Ligand binder design. Sequence first.
Ligand SMILES: COc1ccc(NC(=S)NCCCn2ccnc2)cc1OC
Ligand SMILES: [Cl-]
Ligand SMILES: [Zn+2]
Length: 302
Amino acid sequence: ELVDIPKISYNPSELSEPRFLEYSNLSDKLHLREAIDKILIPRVVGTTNHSIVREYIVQSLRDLDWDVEVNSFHDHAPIKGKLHFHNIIATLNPNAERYLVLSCHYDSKYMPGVEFLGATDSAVPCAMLLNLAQVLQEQLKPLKKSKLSLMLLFFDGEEAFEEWGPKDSIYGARHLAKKWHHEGKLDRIDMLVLLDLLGAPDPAFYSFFENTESWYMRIQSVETRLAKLQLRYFQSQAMRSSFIEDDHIPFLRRNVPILHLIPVPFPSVWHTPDDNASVIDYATTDNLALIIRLFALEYLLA
Ligand SMILES: COc1ccc(NC(=S)NCCCn2ccnc2)cc1OC
Ligand SMILES: [Cl-]
Ligand SMILES: [Zn+2]
C-alpha cells in the first residue's frame, strides 16, 4: 500500500540559495565513470577480483585522507563453504560521536556458469559513494574533526550463494550489526542510508520507515529544488507493509533508523547477466549521484 506522506514530515532543503547553487555545480563525471569501470567486474566473495575491488575502495578513500578499517571475518555459505568476508568502514572522523552513514554492498552475486557483473547491484552505488568523496573533498574537510561526521560503509557478502534466506544472505551486515551492537557502537549511527539497485532508467523511490520519513522528504525536496533551478524519482508517498530485505535488516532490528534508497519496482534486469554496462543510464546516474551529494551536505552542513 502507498500512503501520501503527511505535512508533518515535510522537511524542505535548508541550504542557502548561493550554497545550493555552488554545491549543485560540483561534479566529476569522468571520475564517476572511471570508478564504475574499475568496480564493474565479477567480484564474488573470496575471488581475486573481490580483493581488487576492496583495495580500490580502500586506497581511493585513504588517498582522500579518510580513516579506513577493514572488518574481516569468516563464515560458512552454501556451495562456497568457508569464506573470508571483509566489510569496509571509512570515516572522515574516526573519533566522531555521531555519524550519517551512506552504504551499499561491493560483492557481486555468485551465478553458476555465467559471469554476473551487478552493474546496478551494486557497482554503480559503490562508484557514487567514492565519487561523492572525490567531488566534495573540500566541503567535507571540517567533518574530519566534528562531533557529527560521515561514514561510508561498503558491506561484504550481501548476496546469497544458493537461495536468499535468513542463513544465506547479508553476511557482512549481520556480522557487523551484531559486533557493533555488542560493542555499544550502534547508538552513534544517526541514520543508515542504504543505496541499492541504482543506475538503471526511471527509478521510483518511496519512504519505507516512519522514523526517517522526514529525512526522506529532505531528499525529495533536494530533487524538487534542483528541478526548479533546472539542473521525477522521489515520490511523496510511503510504502507501508513493505518487507524488502537487504543489508539494513540487522540494523533495523536493533533500532537503527534506516533510509532505504532502492527503487520499486526493482530494475527489470535484476539478478540477470543483463545487469551490465549496457543497462546503465548515465543521465539518471549523474542525476541521482548529485541528489545524494546534496542530501549529504544538507544533513551534515545545513
Ligand atoms: C524482483 O523484484 C523483487 C524481488 C524480491 C523482492 N523481495 C525481497 S525481500 N528482496 C530482497 C532483495 C535483496 N537484494 C537486493 C539486491 N540484491 C538482492 C522484492 C521485489 O520487488 C519489490
Ligand atoms: Cl577473480
Ligand atoms: Zn542483488
